[PDB]
Amino acid sequence: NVRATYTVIFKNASGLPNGYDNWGWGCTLSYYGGAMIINPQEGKYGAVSLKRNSGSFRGGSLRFDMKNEGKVKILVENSEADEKFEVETISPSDEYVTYILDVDFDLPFDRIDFQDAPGNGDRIWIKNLVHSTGSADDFVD
Amino acid sequence: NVRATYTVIFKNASGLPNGYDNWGWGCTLSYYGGAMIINPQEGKYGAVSLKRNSGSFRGGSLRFDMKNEGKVKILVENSEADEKFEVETISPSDEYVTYILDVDFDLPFDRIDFQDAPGNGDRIWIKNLVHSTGSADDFVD
Ligand SMILES: OC[C@H]1O[C@@H](O[C@H]2[C@H](O)[C@H](O)[C@H](O[C@H]3[C@H](O)[C@H](O)[C@H](O[C@H]4[C@H](O)[C@H](O)[C@H](O[C@H]5[C@H](O)[C@H](O)[C@H](O[C@H]6[C@H](O)[C@H](O)[C@H](O)O[C@@H]6CO)O[C@@H]5CO)O[C@@H]4CO)O[C@@H]3CO)O[C@@H]2CO)[C@@H](O)[C@@H](O)[C@@H]1O
Ligand SMILES: OC[C@H]1O[C@@H](O[C@H]2[C@H](O)[C@H](O)[C@H](O[C@H]3[C@H](O)[C@H](O)[C@H](O[C@H]4[C@H](O)[C@H](O)[C@H](O[C@H]5[C@H](O)[C@H](O)[C@H](O[C@H]6[C@H](O)[C@H](O)[C@H](O)O[C@@H]6CO)O[C@@H]5CO)O[C@@H]4CO)O[C@@H]3CO)O[C@@H]2CO)[C@@H](O)[C@@H](O)[C@@H]1O
Numbered sequence: 001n002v003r004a005t006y007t008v009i010f011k012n013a014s015g016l017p018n019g020y021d022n023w024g025w026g027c028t029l030s031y032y033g034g035a036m037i038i039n040p041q042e043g044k045y046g047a048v049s050l051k052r053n054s055g056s057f058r059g060g061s062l063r064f065d066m067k068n069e070g071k072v073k074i075l076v077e078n079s080e081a082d083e084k085f086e087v088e089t090i091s092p093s094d095e096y097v098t099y100i101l102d103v104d105f106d107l108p109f110d111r112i113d114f115q116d117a118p119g120n121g122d123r124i125w126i127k128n129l130v131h132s133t134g135s136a137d138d139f140v141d
Numbered sequence: 142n143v144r145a146t147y148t149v150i151f152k153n154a155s156g157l158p159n160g161y162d163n164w165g166w167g168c169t170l171s172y173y174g175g176a177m178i179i180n181p182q183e184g185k186y187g188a189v190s191l192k193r194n195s196g197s198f199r200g201g202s203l204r205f206d207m208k209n210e211g212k213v214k215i216l217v218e219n220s221e222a223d224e225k226f227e228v229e230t231i232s233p234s235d236e237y238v239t240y241i242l243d244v245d246f247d248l249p250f251d252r253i254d255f256q257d258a259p260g261n262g263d264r265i266w267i268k269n270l271v272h273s274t275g276s277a278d279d280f281v282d
Binding site: 001003004005006007008015016017018019133 | 142144145146147148149156157158159160274
């Protein structure tokens with residue numbers, strides 16, 4: 001079979017997802033009209049870090065809508081091993097864009113990070129975050 | 142917080158959900174246009190029994206669309222303890238109806254059952270099966 005398991009982390013955010021903590025640094029988190037808004041401080045390379053309290057994801061792909069004033073680095077991490085893995089760096093956009101990214105990390109992951117890579121304080125807006133156990137090329141919304 | 146975790150088991154079924162086996166008895170399973178179709182044999186009290194291969198659900202609520210020629214019993218079970226729990230019996234309907242049911246079982250569950258309770262061979266059609274960690278009254282699709 002080709003069928004995946006799709007985990008909806010959040011659709012329209014007005015607060016944190018059930019069963020997640022924020023282990024982020026160097027930013028203020030707020031919400032508007034269903035979007036999670038990251039407001040990083042200049043010089044801190046700030047990020048949101050969504051921490052799954054119980055369990056872990058393995059491989060698969062991450063799907064989300066994002067708009068962003070600057071370049072944004074996407075990472076995943078394993079909190080037990082304390083290892084991190086850089087998935088992609090995404091260019092700036094004034095409009096929301098849908099991304100579907102393969103996660104090639106060789107460990108399970110319980111942290112998903114969206115980071116202000118240039119460290120200039122550029123804001124980030126996220127909607128519609130979903131994990132699939134399958135590949136990005138096989139992802140059906 | 143009031144926010145739940147929503148697990149989509151299947152939306153439009155053309156086969157079994159990823160990570161589930163069928164432990165059903167006394168019926169033939171088929172599919173049409175996104176519906177899982179249970180064809181039970183007269184006298185067998187047949188059922189589909191969706192078995193989660195890894196992990197278990199705890200409490201919460203089950204949401205699904207169903208149409209059904211006869212009365213249908215909904216159960217959940219814990220395969221380790223080998224204990225079962227009767228959630229509801231639902232009357233016949235010639236059209237699909239959306240149900241959202243609280244699960245009051247005192248153990249985790251890894252089996253979800255849809256059964257031909259009268260044992261006359263009446264067919265059952267299921268779409269859009271989702272579990273929430275929260276109550277039926279708080280369930281937002
Ligand atoms: O309270 C809750 C629990 O907390 C636990 O402790 C947590 C803690 O809360 C936090 O989550 C922490 O997270 C780590 C994370 O694991 C990871 O190591 C992360 O690494 C960061 C690093 O710190 C920097 O932010 C780094 O920034 C770089 C940029 O990404 C970029 O590459 C940039 O490039 C520039 C380049 O260097 C040059 O200047 C060029 O000219 O310009 C470039 C920019 O245009 O360089 C930046 C700086 O190097 O990114 C990495 C990757 O994200 O850091 C965070 C924070 O430390 O984890 C701990 C757990 O270990 C526990 O305390 C628990 O008990 C609590 O319950
Ligand atoms: O191969 C895969 C693995 O299989 C494992 O073994 C599984 C096995 O495959 C299967 O899944 C089995 O499932 C059990 C289940 O756990 C549960 O015990 C279930 O119980 C049924 C019961 O058998 C009857 O079907 C019962 O029917 C009643 C109706 O619901 C209704 O109440 C009806 O009412 C009538 C009344 O009696 C009277 O006649 C009145 O006038 O009219 C009424 C009708 O109008 O009465 C019916 C009969 O009592 O329903 C219950 C509840 O659903 O039974 C199934 C099947 O046995 O579980 C095992 C695991 O233990 C392992 O082998 C593994 O190794 C494999 O890998």
